[PDB]
Amino acid sequence: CTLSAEDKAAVERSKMIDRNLREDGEKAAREVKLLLLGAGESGKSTIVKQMKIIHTGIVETHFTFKDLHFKMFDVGGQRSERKKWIHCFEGVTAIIFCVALSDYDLVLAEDEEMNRMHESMKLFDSICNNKWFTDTSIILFLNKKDLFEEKIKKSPLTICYPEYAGSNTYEEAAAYIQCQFEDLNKRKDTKEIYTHFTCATDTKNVQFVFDAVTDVIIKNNLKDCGLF
Amino acid sequence: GSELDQLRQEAEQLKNQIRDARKACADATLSQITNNIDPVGRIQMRTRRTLRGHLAKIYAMHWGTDSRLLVSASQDGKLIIWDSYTTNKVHAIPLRSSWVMTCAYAPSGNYVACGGLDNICSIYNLKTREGNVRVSRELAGHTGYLSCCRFLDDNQIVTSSGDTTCALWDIETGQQTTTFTGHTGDVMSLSLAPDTRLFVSGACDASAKLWDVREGMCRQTFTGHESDINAICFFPNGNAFATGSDDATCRLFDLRADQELMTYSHDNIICGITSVSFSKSGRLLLAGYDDFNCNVWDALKADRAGVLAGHDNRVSCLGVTDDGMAVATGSWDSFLKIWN
Amino acid sequence: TASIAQARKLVEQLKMEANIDRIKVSKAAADLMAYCEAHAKEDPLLTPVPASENPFRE
Amino acid sequence: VQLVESGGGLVQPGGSRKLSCSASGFAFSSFGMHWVRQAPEKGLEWVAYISSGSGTIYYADTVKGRFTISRDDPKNTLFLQMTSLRSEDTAMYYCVRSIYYYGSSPFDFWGQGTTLTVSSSDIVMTQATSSVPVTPGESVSISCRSSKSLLHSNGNTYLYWFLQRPGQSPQLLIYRMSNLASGVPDRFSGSGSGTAFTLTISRLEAEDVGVYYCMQHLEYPLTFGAGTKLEL
Amino acid sequence: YDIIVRHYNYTGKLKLTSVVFILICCFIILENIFVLLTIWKTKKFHRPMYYFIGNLALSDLLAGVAYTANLLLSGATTYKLTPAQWFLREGSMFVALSASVFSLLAIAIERYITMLKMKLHNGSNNFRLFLLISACWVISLILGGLPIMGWNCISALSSCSTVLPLYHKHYILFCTTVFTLLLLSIVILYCRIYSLVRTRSRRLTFRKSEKSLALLKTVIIVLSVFIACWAPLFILLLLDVGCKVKTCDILFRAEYFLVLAVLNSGTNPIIYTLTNKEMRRAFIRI
Ligand SMILES: FC(F)(F)c1cccc(-c2noc(-c3cc(-c4ccccc4)c(C(F)(F)F)s3)n2)c1
């Protein structure tokens, strides 16, 4: 109408640009995105190296399993303050967490008073009770168990936890550690915590992650249509 | 161990001397002088254009030199270049790492930069012989994430990373020339001077400094905020600059006289500040708060004179044009609005 | 002994900053007032613009 | 950048061959493509046009509905096929690329061109003269007159200008009103009012000789000028 | 309008409850407009799911208005109306009730479509939302305009129904079939919705429930509230088609069997707003 000759050709370009934008917006929205956290010697490298691998600063790992594309961001090289760059991870499906059971008798470096298990508990409490992650579930991993058994057979658990009445056996010590880790969850009616013990079979870990993601998807679909 | 005590004592008495020198040159505040000027009644600004098309949060925005073209960076990995008049798009430059936190525009309209969380500043070319958009250079010499980068020239760029440092780069060679250090917290905002000879950076622990490009040192330091600094912009004259914060307060400092002039705080706002930019004549101080709306704070009266509340989520970027014709605001709902 | 270097840098930085000259606050206030009152004619924000000139018409 | 064409020779009226060009060196999938005829020792005229993605296709008023044209993005080749042929299409054919956005330069790279021999309302752009004698080192003024005010409501005119070199395809000089193209020296300059347009040259060397043309792009039925020749 | 009184005398037909009843319609209008203003005000409920609930609330308000208008117009003045406005008054009830039932069916269909394939995201096409909103109203208007077109029953004095004169007997038999079909569709759809969530979490979560029991409770209470209300009207409508004229006495006391319809129309928004937590919090905050 009012547009000139070559002004109508510039409008057709914007339409193709918008079409290419909308085509890629529905492709990168059908894949599961999940964050990864943990301590320095919490065995994050072992976790990412044992699972299927298809792929400084942030590191992304892409792997597929049972017709699902997972993206795992390993924020380990960011030495800045965790408060500023945390609000960009608000939209996420799950939050992997890796701790070490045997890391309860080794005192931190350049420090003679506090232990590593207390630091892991404090970091987990800070992650779970954050104002951004008030809806995303948290998958919690127990990496080392054989070394933990070999350490608890020689050294009692009373050195790390001052209050303990059970015997020196793994079957109840692991349950006590798990129960102590689940108690640091103030939001008990909006998110769930899945506890797992890392085994030598990576297929088991991949299946556990897939099942947790499927459960999260089912819960989100039930909450979508207001059915419960 | 005693020499350290002596050094601390000398530093402390230097700070006391600086405080007494700053107190000596002060006689009357600005609010006591500007009480004989008719203030603006109401600034009612309505939306004109609504540029839509993004599919995630928006973290940066910069206006072109001709005040017609602008670029916005989003989390989904796009660097769209819009047209302000006809709402059309000109380019859809993708990105390698879809975690961006800054953007820029060359003063000649040739290049466009984009930092991000992967501590790498990428420089794109827009006037190539072919029809696509290529990556001219990838600067990587920082440890922490980049927060803001401004084009000092067509061949030099300055970046402000998160590892308590700022550095000047060189696009042709690819290596940095001068590094500015001294901050204790992560620097997360900076602005170049109008005459392009100096620039200021706002630290993350209640501190702001003034740097010089040729010598490469700090000249003056400014303090007074409570929490931290979150956004900085220069006065059009070049002898003042307004700093944001997180404890619902923005102030106006002076370069010639290193002392605060006035503060713009209200008992109704308890939310942080995200972006601050002056006006064409330095009379309106636009401020973008994180309570889903903006403000049109007056510059010399400290009295609110308008509210641009036409947004859904927290605003993250806003800037006036070069000729002062319009303003654009971007929020986390992927919607830019051109106010006039 | 390694923090002595940072302490010395801080001490000479304070010393070289303490040599800056100071300008009266009234002069800066008057200069700001003169600047905002001089270029107030070419500011289309606080001064309304007719609808026949703004390129952002609707 | 490179543009080569093939598929020309001697044909009989009633049947015709297909002309194809191969592009290699740029993003062909985002460029609009034209086809410009060139009669021997005459003026050149527009024939067809295809937008990006085969969205809009415009034809000339003389061959409308007689020629078929199409693109091919995966193989980067542009085809032109003629259904009915007459004794007038004996001319040179140039396929030229052009991209339309704010600040672009249409038909900047022309190409080479192919020959074809057959055995046997609208804006009018007129030139001031045909051939004038000129000496090296002298300013020249070339004027091209139109029949309608090319100044649009946007504020910019749509009169394109380029130089035809003897023996090869022409090259753009100034696209919209006076904006100089890339690669050409700053000796060329142009101005106008909207009806009478002019072009001035500061210094004239021995390397820039040929036929000058002025084009009208305000309406999609494009048209060129008669063509003024520069004689050394 | 002389034929209507002679038809009423042929069929056999010749206030305290009403005043109490009006309060019911007022409460229905109040709760429906409350739900509507709650949906419209909050910017969170803007996805196509929360539009079907607004459509259902609007249809419930329209049904309440139609019922109170028909009650006010009813009385000793029934002989004054011309057959035209009488047909309009009698057809408004069907127009409202069919719209309500079809909106319920649309809600169920949308829920099943969302739950079928685990989408991973809320956004979806509006080419289906507008279709499902328009189809219900179209079918309700067609069902309301069908009897006024050719089935006036004014020509045949005997062929008309007994409970409501000037209405073809086969019209009720046609309506009850489509009502039974919609009821069976609702039941089957909710059963499949429950079975899906029951069979996915049972096998796709074998590594490591309580939500399945809550889903079953919600489904069973929804079905037991929707079915128990429309049972007496259904049995009366089938009985009158089966029951012969002048032998059948319970059909004369049909005024009490109609309040259950508006009772269900009023209690459906309560259930649909007290089944989720976000809507409850939004209502409490407002
Ligand atoms: F004279 C009165 F007072 F107006 C009067 C007296 C007796 C009955 C009515 C009356 N109007 O509409 C209805 C009825 C409507 C429906 C219905 C609703 C939705 C879908 C399909 C059917 C009925 C049915 F099929 F579901 F069972 S029944 N009944 C009206």
PDB file of N, CA and C and ligand atoms in Angstrom, chain E residues 8 13 66-67 70-71 74 86 89-102 143 163-165 167 171-172 174-180 182 230-238 251 254-255 257-258 261, ligand 1:
ATOM      1  N   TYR E   8     -52.919 -26.747  27.218  1.00  0.00           N
ATOM      2  CA  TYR E   8     -52.662 -27.001  28.632  1.00  0.00           C
ATOM      3  C   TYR E   8     -53.819 -27.754  29.274  1.00  0.00           C
ATOM      4  N   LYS E  13     -52.540 -29.842  32.868  1.00  0.00           N
ATOM      5  CA  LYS E  13     -52.021 -28.842  33.789  1.00  0.00           C
ATOM      6  C   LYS E  13     -53.027 -27.714  33.976  1.00  0.00           C
ATOM      7  N   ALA E  66     -30.933 -17.608  33.109  1.00  0.00           N
ATOM      8  CA  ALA E  66     -32.058 -18.176  32.374  1.00  0.00           C
ATOM      9  C   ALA E  66     -33.049 -18.846  33.319  1.00  0.00           C
ATOM     10  N   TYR E  67     -32.546 -19.561  34.328  1.00  0.00           N
ATOM     11  CA  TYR E  67     -33.440 -20.239  35.260  1.00  0.00           C
ATOM     12  C   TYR E  67     -34.232 -19.244  36.096  1.00  0.00           C
ATOM     13  N   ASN E  70     -36.892 -17.685  33.861  1.00  0.00           N
ATOM     14  CA  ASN E  70     -37.995 -18.612  33.625  1.00  0.00           C
ATOM     15  C   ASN E  70     -38.850 -18.782  34.873  1.00  0.00           C
ATOM     16  N   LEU E  71     -38.235 -18.699  36.055  1.00  0.00           N
ATOM     17  CA  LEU E  71     -39.002 -18.812  37.289  1.00  0.00           C
ATOM     18  C   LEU E  71     -39.845 -17.565  37.528  1.00  0.00           C
ATOM     19  N   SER E  74     -42.747 -17.605  35.187  1.00  0.00           N
ATOM     20  CA  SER E  74     -43.715 -18.656  35.468  1.00  0.00           C
ATOM     21  C   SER E  74     -44.704 -18.202  36.534  1.00  0.00           C
ATOM     22  N   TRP E  86     -43.045 -17.789  24.472  1.00  0.00           N
ATOM     23  CA  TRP E  86     -43.088 -19.011  25.269  1.00  0.00           C
ATOM     24  C   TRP E  86     -42.037 -20.008  24.797  1.00  0.00           C
ATOM     25  N   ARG E  89     -38.639 -18.703  25.928  1.00  0.00           N
ATOM     26  CA  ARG E  89     -38.405 -18.946  27.347  1.00  0.00           C
ATOM     27  C   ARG E  89     -38.091 -20.414  27.610  1.00  0.00           C
ATOM     28  N   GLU E  90     -38.770 -21.317  26.902  1.00  0.00           N
ATOM     29  CA  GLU E  90     -38.535 -22.740  27.127  1.00  0.00           C
ATOM     30  C   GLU E  90     -37.225 -23.199  26.495  1.00  0.00           C
ATOM     31  N   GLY E  91     -36.788 -22.537  25.422  1.00  0.00           N
ATOM     32  CA  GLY E  91     -35.574 -22.960  24.746  1.00  0.00           C
ATOM     33  C   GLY E  91     -34.311 -22.378  25.347  1.00  0.00           C
ATOM     34  N   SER E  92     -34.430 -21.254  26.061  1.00  0.00           N
ATOM     35  CA  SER E  92     -33.261 -20.689  26.729  1.00  0.00           C
ATOM     36  C   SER E  92     -32.658 -21.679  27.723  1.00  0.00           C
ATOM     37  N   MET E  93     -33.509 -22.448  28.407  1.00  0.00           N
ATOM     38  CA  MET E  93     -33.020 -23.441  29.358  1.00  0.00           C
ATOM     39  C   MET E  93     -32.155 -24.489  28.668  1.00  0.00           C
ATOM     40  N   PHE E  94     -32.629 -25.026  27.541  1.00  0.00           N
ATOM     41  CA  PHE E  94     -31.838 -25.999  26.795  1.00  0.00           C
ATOM     42  C   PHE E  94     -30.548 -25.376  26.280  1.00  0.00           C
ATOM     43  N   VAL E  95     -30.624 -24.134  25.790  1.00  0.00           N
ATOM     44  CA  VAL E  95     -29.436 -23.455  25.282  1.00  0.00           C
ATOM     45  C   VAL E  95     -28.379 -23.336  26.373  1.00  0.00           C
ATOM     46  N   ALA E  96     -28.803 -23.061  27.606  1.00  0.00           N
ATOM     47  CA  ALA E  96     -27.843 -22.922  28.697  1.00  0.00           C
ATOM     48  C   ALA E  96     -27.292 -24.275  29.138  1.00  0.00           C
ATOM     49  N   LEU E  97     -28.168 -25.274  29.286  1.00  0.00           N
ATOM     50  CA  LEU E  97     -27.731 -26.561  29.818  1.00  0.00           C
ATOM     51  C   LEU E  97     -26.809 -27.288  28.846  1.00  0.00           C
ATOM     52  N   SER E  98     -27.152 -27.289  27.554  1.00  0.00           N
ATOM     53  CA  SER E  98     -26.266 -27.887  26.566  1.00  0.00           C
ATOM     54  C   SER E  98     -24.913 -27.197  26.523  1.00  0.00           C
ATOM     55  N   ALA E  99     -24.884 -25.867  26.639  1.00  0.00           N
ATOM     56  CA  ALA E  99     -23.616 -25.150  26.678  1.00  0.00           C
ATOM     57  C   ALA E  99     -22.783 -25.554  27.887  1.00  0.00           C
ATOM     58  N   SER E 100     -23.421 -25.705  29.051  1.00  0.00           N
ATOM     59  CA  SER E 100     -22.690 -26.130  30.244  1.00  0.00           C
ATOM     60  C   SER E 100     -22.083 -27.518  30.057  1.00  0.00           C
ATOM     61  N   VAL E 101     -22.886 -28.472  29.581  1.00  0.00           N
ATOM     62  CA  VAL E 101     -22.391 -29.839  29.427  1.00  0.00           C
ATOM     63  C   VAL E 101     -21.280 -29.895  28.383  1.00  0.00           C
ATOM     64  N   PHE E 102     -21.428 -29.140  27.292  1.00  0.00           N
ATOM     65  CA  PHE E 102     -20.396 -29.149  26.262  1.00  0.00           C
ATOM     66  C   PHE E 102     -19.121 -28.463  26.736  1.00  0.00           C
ATOM     67  N   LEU E 143     -29.238 -26.532  18.896  1.00  0.00           N
ATOM     68  CA  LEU E 143     -30.198 -27.336  19.646  1.00  0.00           C
ATOM     69  C   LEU E 143     -31.345 -26.479  20.167  1.00  0.00           C
ATOM     70  N   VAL E 163     -45.040 -33.377  30.205  1.00  0.00           N
ATOM     71  CA  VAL E 163     -44.520 -32.491  31.246  1.00  0.00           C
ATOM     72  C   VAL E 163     -44.489 -31.051  30.747  1.00  0.00           C
ATOM     73  N   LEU E 164     -44.137 -30.859  29.475  1.00  0.00           N
ATOM     74  CA  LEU E 164     -44.075 -29.544  28.867  1.00  0.00           C
ATOM     75  C   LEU E 164     -44.834 -29.630  27.549  1.00  0.00           C
ATOM     76  N   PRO E 165     -45.986 -28.975  27.438  1.00  0.00           N
ATOM     77  CA  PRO E 165     -46.728 -28.991  26.174  1.00  0.00           C
ATOM     78  C   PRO E 165     -46.004 -28.188  25.105  1.00  0.00           C
ATOM     79  N   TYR E 167     -44.236 -29.256  22.752  1.00  0.00           N
ATOM     80  CA  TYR E 167     -42.906 -29.810  22.534  1.00  0.00           C
ATOM     81  C   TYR E 167     -43.049 -31.231  22.015  1.00  0.00           C
ATOM     82  N   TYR E 171     -38.457 -35.223  20.480  1.00  0.00           N
ATOM     83  CA  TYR E 171     -37.371 -34.287  20.759  1.00  0.00           C
ATOM     84  C   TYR E 171     -36.647 -34.656  22.050  1.00  0.00           C
ATOM     85  N   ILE E 172     -37.402 -35.032  23.083  1.00  0.00           N
ATOM     86  CA  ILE E 172     -36.792 -35.460  24.339  1.00  0.00           C
ATOM     87  C   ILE E 172     -36.002 -36.747  24.137  1.00  0.00           C
ATOM     88  N   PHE E 174     -34.550 -37.663  21.432  1.00  0.00           N
ATOM     89  CA  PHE E 174     -33.324 -37.308  20.725  1.00  0.00           C
ATOM     90  C   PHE E 174     -32.309 -36.676  21.669  1.00  0.00           C
ATOM     91  N   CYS E 175     -32.775 -35.822  22.585  1.00  0.00           N
ATOM     92  CA  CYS E 175     -31.854 -35.125  23.480  1.00  0.00           C
ATOM     93  C   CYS E 175     -31.223 -36.076  24.494  1.00  0.00           C
ATOM     94  N   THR E 176     -32.001 -37.035  25.005  1.00  0.00           N
ATOM     95  CA  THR E 176     -31.474 -37.927  26.034  1.00  0.00           C
ATOM     96  C   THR E 176     -30.358 -38.808  25.483  1.00  0.00           C
ATOM     97  N   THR E 177     -30.427 -39.159  24.197  1.00  0.00           N
ATOM     98  CA  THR E 177     -29.379 -39.979  23.599  1.00  0.00           C
ATOM     99  C   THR E 177     -28.051 -39.233  23.561  1.00  0.00           C
ATOM    100  N   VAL E 178     -28.068 -37.973  23.118  1.00  0.00           N
ATOM    101  CA  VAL E 178     -26.823 -37.213  23.067  1.00  0.00           C
ATOM    102  C   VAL E 178     -26.323 -36.912  24.473  1.00  0.00           C
ATOM    103  N   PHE E 179     -27.235 -36.753  25.439  1.00  0.00           N
ATOM    104  CA  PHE E 179     -26.790 -36.574  26.819  1.00  0.00           C
ATOM    105  C   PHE E 179     -26.083 -37.822  27.337  1.00  0.00           C
ATOM    106  N   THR E 180     -26.655 -39.000  27.073  1.00  0.00           N
ATOM    107  CA  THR E 180     -26.010 -40.247  27.474  1.00  0.00           C
ATOM    108  C   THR E 180     -24.657 -40.409  26.792  1.00  0.00           C
ATOM    109  N   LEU E 182     -22.615 -37.983  25.776  1.00  0.00           N
ATOM    110  CA  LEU E 182     -21.658 -37.078  26.409  1.00  0.00           C
ATOM    111  C   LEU E 182     -21.233 -37.593  27.778  1.00  0.00           C
ATOM    112  N   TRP E 230     -27.565 -35.165  37.769  1.00  0.00           N
ATOM    113  CA  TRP E 230     -28.326 -35.298  36.533  1.00  0.00           C
ATOM    114  C   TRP E 230     -29.064 -36.626  36.418  1.00  0.00           C
ATOM    115  N   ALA E 231     -29.175 -37.392  37.500  1.00  0.00           N
ATOM    116  CA  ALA E 231     -29.860 -38.679  37.447  1.00  0.00           C
ATOM    117  C   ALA E 231     -31.382 -38.539  37.500  1.00  0.00           C
ATOM    118  N   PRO E 232     -31.957 -37.774  38.442  1.00  0.00           N
ATOM    119  CA  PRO E 232     -33.427 -37.685  38.481  1.00  0.00           C
ATOM    120  C   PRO E 232     -34.025 -37.041  37.244  1.00  0.00           C
ATOM    121  N   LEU E 233     -33.417 -35.972  36.730  1.00  0.00           N
ATOM    122  CA  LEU E 233     -33.911 -35.367  35.499  1.00  0.00           C
ATOM    123  C   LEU E 233     -33.823 -36.339  34.331  1.00  0.00           C
ATOM    124  N   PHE E 234     -32.751 -37.132  34.272  1.00  0.00           N
ATOM    125  CA  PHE E 234     -32.603 -38.123  33.212  1.00  0.00           C
ATOM    126  C   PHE E 234     -33.693 -39.186  33.288  1.00  0.00           C
ATOM    127  N   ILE E 235     -33.940 -39.724  34.488  1.00  0.00           N
ATOM    128  CA  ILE E 235     -34.962 -40.758  34.611  1.00  0.00           C
ATOM    129  C   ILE E 235     -36.347 -40.183  34.346  1.00  0.00           C
ATOM    130  N   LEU E 236     -36.591 -38.922  34.715  1.00  0.00           N
ATOM    131  CA  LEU E 236     -37.885 -38.315  34.418  1.00  0.00           C
ATOM    132  C   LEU E 236     -38.069 -38.110  32.920  1.00  0.00           C
ATOM    133  N   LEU E 237     -37.016 -37.657  32.232  1.00  0.00           N
ATOM    134  CA  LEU E 237     -37.105 -37.442  30.794  1.00  0.00           C
ATOM    135  C   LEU E 237     -37.319 -38.747  30.041  1.00  0.00           C
ATOM    136  N   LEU E 238     -36.668 -39.833  30.465  1.00  0.00           N
ATOM    137  CA  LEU E 238     -36.924 -41.104  29.792  1.00  0.00           C
ATOM    138  C   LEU E 238     -38.282 -41.680  30.172  1.00  0.00           C
ATOM    139  N   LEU E 251     -45.240 -36.925  36.905  1.00  0.00           N
ATOM    140  CA  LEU E 251     -44.728 -35.909  35.991  1.00  0.00           C
ATOM    141  C   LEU E 251     -45.259 -34.518  36.315  1.00  0.00           C
ATOM    142  N   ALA E 254     -42.887 -31.780  38.675  1.00  0.00           N
ATOM    143  CA  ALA E 254     -41.580 -31.683  38.041  1.00  0.00           C
ATOM    144  C   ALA E 254     -40.846 -30.394  38.378  1.00  0.00           C
ATOM    145  N   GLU E 255     -41.448 -29.512  39.179  1.00  0.00           N
ATOM    146  CA  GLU E 255     -40.776 -28.268  39.538  1.00  0.00           C
ATOM    147  C   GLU E 255     -39.622 -28.520  40.500  1.00  0.00           C
ATOM    148  N   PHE E 257     -37.733 -31.271  40.528  1.00  0.00           N
ATOM    149  CA  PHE E 257     -36.672 -32.018  39.867  1.00  0.00           C
ATOM    150  C   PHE E 257     -35.793 -31.146  38.981  1.00  0.00           C
ATOM    151  N   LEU E 258     -36.031 -29.835  38.944  1.00  0.00           N
ATOM    152  CA  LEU E 258     -35.230 -28.930  38.131  1.00  0.00           C
ATOM    153  C   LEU E 258     -34.195 -28.159  38.934  1.00  0.00           C
ATOM    154  N   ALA E 261     -30.445 -29.276  38.709  1.00  0.00           N
ATOM    155  CA  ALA E 261     -29.610 -28.845  37.592  1.00  0.00           C
ATOM    156  C   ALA E 261     -28.830 -27.585  37.945  1.00  0.00           C
TER     157      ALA E 261
HETATM  158  F1  LIG F   1     -41.139 -25.445  32.075  1.00  0.00           F
HETATM  159  C1  LIG F   1     -39.859 -25.401  32.544  1.00  0.00           C
HETATM  160  F2  LIG F   1     -39.919 -24.997  33.846  1.00  0.00           F
HETATM  161  F3  LIG F   1     -39.212 -24.457  31.810  1.00  0.00           F
HETATM  162  C2  LIG F   1     -39.136 -26.764  32.411  1.00  0.00           C
HETATM  163  C3  LIG F   1     -39.697 -27.917  32.948  1.00  0.00           C
HETATM  164  C4  LIG F   1     -39.061 -29.147  32.835  1.00  0.00           C
HETATM  165  C5  LIG F   1     -37.849 -29.245  32.182  1.00  0.00           C
HETATM  166  C6  LIG F   1     -37.276 -28.113  31.647  1.00  0.00           C
HETATM  167  C7  LIG F   1     -36.067 -28.234  30.998  1.00  0.00           C
HETATM  168  N1  LIG F   1     -35.490 -27.305  30.272  1.00  0.00           N
HETATM  169  O1  LIG F   1     -34.322 -27.815  29.808  1.00  0.00           O
HETATM  170  C8  LIG F   1     -34.214 -29.053  30.315  1.00  0.00           C
HETATM  171  C9  LIG F   1     -33.217 -29.984  30.045  1.00  0.00           C
HETATM  172  C10 LIG F   1     -31.997 -29.877  29.378  1.00  0.00           C
HETATM  173  C11 LIG F   1     -31.279 -31.056  29.211  1.00  0.00           C
HETATM  174  C12 LIG F   1     -30.048 -31.180  28.594  1.00  0.00           C
HETATM  175  C13 LIG F   1     -28.984 -30.364  28.898  1.00  0.00           C
HETATM  176  C14 LIG F   1     -27.761 -30.502  28.266  1.00  0.00           C
HETATM  177  C15 LIG F   1     -27.596 -31.482  27.324  1.00  0.00           C
HETATM  178  C16 LIG F   1     -28.657 -32.299  27.017  1.00  0.00           C
HETATM  179  C17 LIG F   1     -29.876 -32.153  27.647  1.00  0.00           C
HETATM  180  C18 LIG F   1     -31.896 -32.165  29.709  1.00  0.00           C
HETATM  181  C19 LIG F   1     -31.362 -33.569  29.673  1.00  0.00           C
HETATM  182  F4  LIG F   1     -31.538 -34.077  28.430  1.00  0.00           F
HETATM  183  F5  LIG F   1     -30.048 -33.463  29.958  1.00  0.00           F
HETATM  184  F6  LIG F   1     -32.013 -34.386  30.536  1.00  0.00           F
HETATM  185  S1  LIG F   1     -33.374 -31.650  30.387  1.00  0.00           S
HETATM  186  N2  LIG F   1     -35.305 -29.305  31.011  1.00  0.00           N
HETATM  187  C20 LIG F   1     -37.913 -26.883  31.752  1.00  0.00           C
END
